[PDB]
Design a protein around this ligand. Structure first.
Ligand SMILES: *[C@@H]1O[C@H](CO)[C@@H](O[C@@H]2O[C@H](CO)[C@@H](O[C@@H]3O[C@H](CO[C@H]4O[C@H](CO[C@H]5O[C@H](CO)[C@@H](O)[C@H](O)[C@@H]5O[C@H]5O[C@H](CO)[C@@H](O)[C@H](O)[C@@H]5O)[C@@H](O)[C@H](O[C@H]5O[C@H](CO)[C@@H](O)[C@H](O)[C@@H]5O[C@H]5O[C@H](CO)[C@@H](O)[C@H](O)[C@@H]5O)[C@@H]4O)[C@@H](O)[C@H](O[C@H]4O[C@H](CO)[C@@H](O)[C@H](O)[C@@H]4O[C@H]4O[C@H](CO)[C@@H](O)[C@H](O)[C@@H]4O[C@H]4O[C@H](CO)[C@@H](O)[C@H](O)[C@@H]4O)[C@@H]3O)[C@H](O)[C@H]2NC(C)=O)[C@H](O)[C@H]1NC(C)=O
Ligand SMILES: *[C@@H]1O[C@H](CO)[C@@H](O[C@@H]2O[C@H](CO)[C@@H](O[C@@H]3O[C@H](CO)[C@@H](O)[C@H](O)[C@@H]3O)[C@H](O)[C@H]2NC(C)=O)[C@H](O)[C@H]1NC(C)=O
Ligand SMILES: *[C@@H]1O[C@H](CO[C@H]2O[C@H](CO)[C@@H](O)[C@H](O)[C@@H]2O)[C@@H](O[C@@H]2O[C@H](CO)[C@@H](O)[C@H](O)[C@H]2NC(C)=O)[C@H](O)[C@H]1NC(C)=O
Ligand SMILES: CC(C)[C@H](C)[C@@H](O)[C@H](O)[C@@H](C)[C@H]1CC[C@H]2[C@@H]3CC(=O)[C@H]4C[C@H](O)[C@H](O)C[C@]4(C)[C@H]3CC[C@]12C
Ligand SMILES: *[C@@H]1O[C@H](CO)[C@@H](O[C@@H]2O[C@H](CO)[C@@H](O)[C@H](O)[C@H]2NC(C)=O)[C@H](O)[C@H]1NC(C)=O
Ligand SMILES: *[C@@H]1O[C@H](CO)[C@@H](O[C@@H]2O[C@H](CO)[C@@H](O)[C@H](O)[C@H]2NC(C)=O)[C@H](O)[C@H]1NC(C)=O
Ligand SMILES: *[C@@H]1O[C@H](CO)[C@@H](O[C@@H]2O[C@H](CO)[C@@H](O)[C@H](O)[C@H]2NC(C)=O)[C@H](O)[C@H]1NC(C)=O
Ligand SMILES: *[C@@H]1O[C@H](CO)[C@@H](O[C@@H]2O[C@H](CO)[C@@H](O)[C@H](O)[C@H]2NC(C)=O)[C@H](O)[C@H]1NC(C)=O
Ligand SMILES: *[C@@H]1O[C@H](CO)[C@@H](O[C@@H]2O[C@H](CO)[C@@H](O)[C@H](O)[C@H]2NC(C)=O)[C@H](O)[C@H]1NC(C)=O
Ligand SMILES: *[C@@H]1O[C@H](CO)[C@@H](O)[C@H](O)[C@H]1NC(C)=O
Ligand SMILES: *[C@@H]1O[C@H](CO)[C@@H](O)[C@H](O)[C@H]1NC(C)=O
Length: 720
């Protein structure tokens, strides 16, 4: 069994697909294989090779001298059981694969006594935790079981049963359970990084052994169900080296113990967000000269501690306090934080004016992100913000601002996200956008009082992902240059007074997936190029953004098919009381993060053109939109017939064609539409039988009413 042969064996009895030809030259000359001088294999590096196969580690460990095995970033599944061979690995990397049989972990823990670092992260390893590395293993230092599918309670001695040289143990990203106080860390020597984050571990007390981890640098216990008070008193003196602590998204309550400031000699990161903490950051925390990231969001904190305490922290660079009860005016002492790059105070009870002193710092300010959404700020957008040349994101939405958008905002060089919807801002969009100022990714100013037209200059914002200007007082034509924005994914211009034709150039927007021009004054014909991207849409950087969708539940009497709104830093409760939510008698609020449902070769997703004066026939190409979930062409002057191609709108759930002048029959293929949950073809001149398949026979009468001779259930039968 020569080493040269085993790899070829592995290549034939494992690899199922090599679309990149990563092994075409297949001992030492081969790709990924590193050799020693004596002519023995000691390393196999096949990371990110797009390999599809079935890994059985015993066929690689047969190699006598193999100590390095990199298979991370592939599509390897788990193979048969062990053929009983000897292991010599020191480094093993099986990350980002499709392993499922966790026996591969029991084998590496039983054998592989020279194992230094192992990583199974981002696989599908299932089952309960059981085996810890062999006691004969005297070198293992880092072990990463994170982001798998492990289950059930953790063994009481699991962590403690690790060799004494362990330094880094990552168990985050599974669904293990258990009262945390019953878990033993043992003497917990040499341990510096430990994470149980993102599991279902309960516990109202910490285990006593944890206090033995005197060398701990990162303690991450976030996204569990730990309850009670944060351990105070002298407890945090055990961790004289702790640099990062996270107790976020647990069930902790009470005040933040002043004794937690024992970590302030070395603490660099604290995340206590997502609990039910009250009071303020105790004054004792002034000694945190090393703290860089303070995240206390989604709690119930209040008081003046931003000024009494946080302003005294010099190394602060990332400050998060959104979703709290902090009232009053924003403190100006926060400018004494000279190294502050990101600041988030959204969803508090702030009053007064926008903070601006950050920019007139004796030096240039490094502030890049300023977020104060869902507060009660008033006045105008300070022109002083134009001095913060490092600014990239500005979120002032859902305040009570008024006045114009200063020229100095639109010329901030690095600006990227300009977000101030749900205010009373006036003025227009400069003709000098993205030319003298930053090339934006998001321009979200819906529900304001802006006026004028949309500058043709918008064509210069080639990085644009999301435009929202709905419910303003805009006029003019939609500039044809919009078609140059090939990264533009979302475009909302509803509830304005726009005139002209729908530009054919919209079809050049390669990534456009959401188009809302409803309730304007547009004329002309439906451009056929709006579907010219069906089956070609690539996903893009617009994904991963907080949104909320308010579904108007009032048929066609309610204008538009709902409301999609950017929702960073905003409370749902504040939306459910927005009068535009009362615009429809009945509503439901969906919320989440923007996420494509196709990896490539997609189509448009949302199209609302209702309440205009567009005329002509429905372009047949519109039936090709396979991922289209909404099509609202209602309330126009459309003529002709409903294309039978509409039978290929497999993803559609809402289809509004009412209050037009459509003739002919309903395509029978609509019956094949398995997600069609809301159809309205009433108030046309449609005729003939209603398609007998799908949900079309169960809809209310009002969805077919006022036509010229429709028949069939739910209408009277056509034969009488
Ligand atoms: C422990 O451990 C843990 C784990 O376990 C961790 O955690 C982590 O962390 C991290 C950090 O980073 C993160 O990541 C990140 O994130 C972000 C986002 O975030 C957000 O969100 C998320 C999500 O959420 C979700 O999920 C969850 C769970 O799963 C839940 O809970 C929720 O609810 C949700 O869910 C939802 O959704 C989903 C999806 O869709 C679905 O499915 C469901 O159903 C629903 O619907 C989260 O997670 C987060 O959280 C956070 O935060 C918060 C607030 O803050 C808090 O509370 C928490 O705790 C956390 O925290 C954190 O953070 C913070 C701040 O914030 C701090 O402070 C602390 O410390 C911590 O850390 C939130 O909410 C994003 O953004 C990202 O992404 C990024 O990155 C990546 C890589 O990694 C890439 O790829 C991408 O793209 C991006 O990037 C960016 O950035 C960069 C830089 O770096 C660059 O490069 C790029 O470009 C970008 O940029 C930007 O910008 C620019 C300009 O500048 C432009 O251009 C562009 O375009 C853009 O825009 C990431 O991913 C994660 O997430 C976490 N996880 C967890 C689990 O949590 C921690 O860390 C630890 N700790 C310690 C150690 O201490
Ligand atoms: C700290 O701030 C939070 C967040 O703003 C406050 O919680 C909110 O308090 C209002 C008070 O009316 C709650 O509204 C009530 O809720 C239910 C309907 O959900 C109903 O029983 C009442 O008619 C009323 O509308 C609101 O739901 C609540 N928000 C959340 C997310 O729980 C809190 O009151 C503030 N605390 C102090 C001491 O100021
Ligand atoms: C832009 O369009 C609005 C509204 O017109 C559309 O709706 C109204 C019904 O609301 C309907 O009458 C019209 O045919 C379109 O479907 C215009 O404002 C409306 O003007 C009509 C004129 O009869 C008045 O009866 C309405 O009260 C008035 N307002 C509303 C809310 O309807 C507006 O004039 C148009 N602007 C331009 C520049 O064309
Ligand atoms: C920008 C993209 C990525 C998106 C923001 C994406 O992330 C969202 O998931 C987006 C596609 C989701 C969020 C809200 C959804 C609608 C909510 C709703 O009330 C439903 C009622 C009924 O069930 C109908 O049949 C289908 C309806 C209309 C849904 C269509 C799909 C929507 C729009
Ligand atoms: C690991 O090597 C063993 C030993 O060659 C492989 O087991 C054989 O697989 C072939 C092909 O499927 C069968 O015909 C034999 O009956 C198997 N047993 C033997 C030879 O004793 C095994 O398939 C290899 N595993 C992987 C994942 O490559
Ligand atoms: C990764 O490999 C898995 C199998 O391990 C592939 O999943 C199969 O893909 C075929 C099409 O090639 C489907 O017919 C099967 O139903 C799939 N099986 C399972 C269990 O999902 C998967 O396509 C591969 N992914 C790649 C190469 O990106
Ligand atoms: C479109 O935007 C306008 C902006 O004025 C909204 O008009 C509001 O309508 C309500 C109806 O109850 C009035 O109470 C408000 O006073 C109006 N706003 C203002 C600023 O006067 C309208 O609701 C939006 N939606 C549509 C037309 O469907
Ligand atoms: C998915 O998109 C790809 C993009 O590559 C399409 O395939 C290529 O399209 C480009 C133009 O973008 C042509 O120059 C290539 O000749 C195409 N290659 C092919 C077809 O192999 C692909 O057609 C799209 N798929 C669907 C279902 O629309
Ligand atoms: C079908 O058309 C009739 C006639 O226009 C509609 O009845 C009108 O309803 C509006 C508001 O609902 C009233 O202001 C009118 O006075 C009504 N006219 C008559 C003659 O009664 C009816 O609502 C339409 N049906 C649907 C489902 O839209
Ligand atoms: C582990 O800790 C023990 C006792 O403190 C020490 O002797 C040993 O050298 C440490 N091992 C490593 C690899 O640091
Ligand atoms: C505009 O001002 C009025 C003043 O009464 C206020 O009620 C309204 O909420 C403001 N608009 C917003 C916050 O979008």
């Amino acid at each position: 069994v020569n080493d040269t042969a085993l790899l070829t064996a592995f290549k034939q009895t494992s690899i199922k697909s090599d679309p990149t030809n990563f092994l075409g030259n297949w001992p030492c000359t081969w790709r990924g294989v590193s050799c020693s001088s004596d002519g023995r294999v000691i390393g196999l590096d096949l990371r990110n090779g797009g390999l599809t196969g079935t890994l059985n580690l015993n066929n690689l460990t047969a190699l006598s001298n193999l100590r390095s095995l990199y298979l991370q970033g592939n599509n390897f599944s788990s193979g048969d059981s062990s053929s009983s061979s000897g292991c010599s690995l020191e480094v093993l990397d099986l990350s980002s694969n499709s392993l499922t049989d966790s026996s591969i972990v029991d084998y590496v823990f039983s054998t592989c006594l020279n194992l230094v670092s192992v990583n199974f992260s981002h696989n599908k390893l299932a089952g309960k935790l059981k085996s810890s590395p062999s006691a004969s293993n005297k070198r293992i230092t880092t072990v990463d079981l994170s982001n798998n599918r492990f289950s059930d309670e953790i063994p009481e001695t699991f962590i403690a049963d690790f060799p004494n040289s362990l330094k880094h143990l990552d168990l985050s990203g599974n669904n293990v359970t258990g009262d945390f106080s019953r878990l033993s860390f043992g003497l917990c020597e040499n341990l510096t990084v430990f994470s149980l984050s993102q599991n279902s571990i309960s516990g109202d007390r910490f285990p006593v052994s944890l206090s033995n981890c005197k060398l701990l640098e990162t303690l991450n216990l976030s996204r569990n169900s730990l309850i009670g008070k944060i351990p105070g008193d002298d407890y945090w003196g055990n961790f004289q080296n702790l640099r990062q602590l996270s107790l976020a998204h647990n069930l902790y309550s009470g005040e933040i113990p002043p004794e937690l400031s024992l970590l302030c000699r070395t603490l660099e990161v604290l995340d206590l967000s997502g609990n039910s903490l009250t009071g303020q950051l105790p004054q004792s925390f002034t000694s945190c000269g090393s703290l860089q990231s303070l995240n206390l969001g989604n709690n119930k904190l209040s008081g003046d501690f931003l000024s009494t305490v946080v302003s005294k922290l010099s190394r602060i660079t990332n400050l998060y306090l959104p979703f709290n009860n902090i009232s009053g005016s924003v403190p100006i002492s926060l400018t004494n934080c000279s190294n502050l790059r990101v600041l988030d105070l959204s969803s508090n009870e702030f009053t007064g004016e926008v903070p601006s002193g950050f920019c007139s710092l004796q030096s240039s300010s490094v502030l890049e992100k300023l977020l104060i959404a869902n507060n009660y700020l008033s006045g105008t957008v300070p022109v002083e913000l134009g001095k913060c040349k490092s600014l990239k994101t500005i979120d002032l939405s859902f305040n009570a601002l008024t006045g114009l958008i200063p020229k100095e905002i639109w010329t901030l060089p690095k600006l990227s996200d300009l977000v101030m919807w749900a205010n009373n801002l006036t003025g227009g969009i400069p003709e000098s956008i993205c030319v003298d100022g930053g090339n934006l990714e998001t321009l979200i100013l819906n529900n304001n009082l802006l006026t004028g037209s949309l500058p043709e200059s918008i064509s210069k914002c080639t990085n644009m992902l999301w435009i929202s200007l709905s419910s303003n007082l805009l006029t003019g034509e939609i500039p044809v240059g919009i078609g140059k924005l090939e990264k533009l994914a979302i475009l909302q211009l509803g509830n304005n007074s726009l005139t002209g034709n729908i530009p054919s150039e919209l079809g050049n927007c390669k990534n456009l997936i959401w188009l809302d021009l409803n309730s304007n004054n547009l004329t002309g014909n439906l451009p056929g190029e709006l579907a010219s991207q069906a089956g070609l849409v690539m996903p893009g950087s617009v994904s991963g953004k907080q949104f909320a969708f308010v579904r108007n539940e009032g048929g066609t009497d309610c204008r538009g098919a709902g409301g999609l709104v950017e929702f960073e830093g905003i409370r749902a409760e504040r939306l459910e009381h927005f009068p535009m939510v009362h615009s429809c008698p009945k509503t439901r609020i969906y919320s989440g993060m923007t996420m494509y449902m196709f990896s490539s070769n997609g189509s448009m997703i949302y199209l609302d053109l209702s309440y205009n004066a567009v005329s002509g026939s429905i372009p047949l190409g519109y039936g090709a939109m396979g991922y289209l979930q909404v099509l609202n062409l209602g309330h126009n002057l459309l003529t002709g017939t409903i294309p039978d191609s509409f039978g290929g709108l497999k993803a559609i759930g809402v289809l509004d064609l009412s209050h037009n002048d459509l003739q002919g029959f309903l395509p029978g293929s609509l019956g094949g539409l398995s997600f069609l949950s809301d159809l309205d073809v009433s108030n046309n001149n449609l005729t003939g039988p209603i398609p007998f398949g799908g949900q079309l026979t169960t809809f209310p009468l009002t969805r077919y009413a006022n036509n010229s001779g429709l028949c069939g259930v739910p209408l009277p039968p056509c034969s009488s």
